[PDB]
Design a binder for this molecule. Structure first.
Ligand code: HEC
Length: 114
């Protein structure tokens, strides 16, 4: 949860993500508190879109486990909601971050991206 230390982790996210514009991935400014699959102008996968449609809002707490394994997180979310059939595909985000402290720091960084 050290946002300054999260800057260095955020350099990897900048391959695909900017704060205000879409690129390979959606724009991330305001992502903490945003309904999944809704950055204006971004075309999301069905797995991410259906997760937000089922109510998923990204928070400082749930982005941490998400970053360890995006597919697993989103599948488990829709399964828990009784919507396992909507989680058969995969996300466009092919990156994963294993280290828990790095995930917590980068999420503290994201929370400052207003
Ligand atoms: C390119 C290889 C990426 C890397 C590096 C990072 N992300 Fe990503 N992210 C990528 C895509 C293509 C998408 C769209 C996913 C889909 O299935 O449509 C995403 C999505 C996210 C999200 C969800 C955003 C939303 O629902 O609006 C988050 C919270 C996210 N990505 C965070 C994130 C972080 C913090 C990264 C660095 C640690 C990171 N991503 C790397 C592509 C890529």
């Amino acid at each position: 949860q050290d946002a300054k230390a999260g800057e260095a982790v955020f350099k990897q996210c900048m391959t695909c993500h900017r704060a205000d514009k879409n690129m390979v991935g959606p724009a991330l400014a305001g992502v903490v508190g945003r309904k999944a699959g809704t950055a204006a102008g971004f075309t999301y996968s069905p797995l991410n879109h259906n997760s937000g449609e089922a109510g998923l809002v990204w928070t400082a707490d749930n982005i941490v486990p998400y970053l360890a394994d995006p597919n697993a997180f989103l599948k488990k979310f829709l399964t828990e909601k009784g919507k396992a059939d909507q989680a058969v595909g995969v996300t466009k985000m092919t990156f994963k971050l294993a280290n828990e402290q790095q995930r917590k720091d980068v999420v503290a960084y994201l929370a400052t991206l207003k």
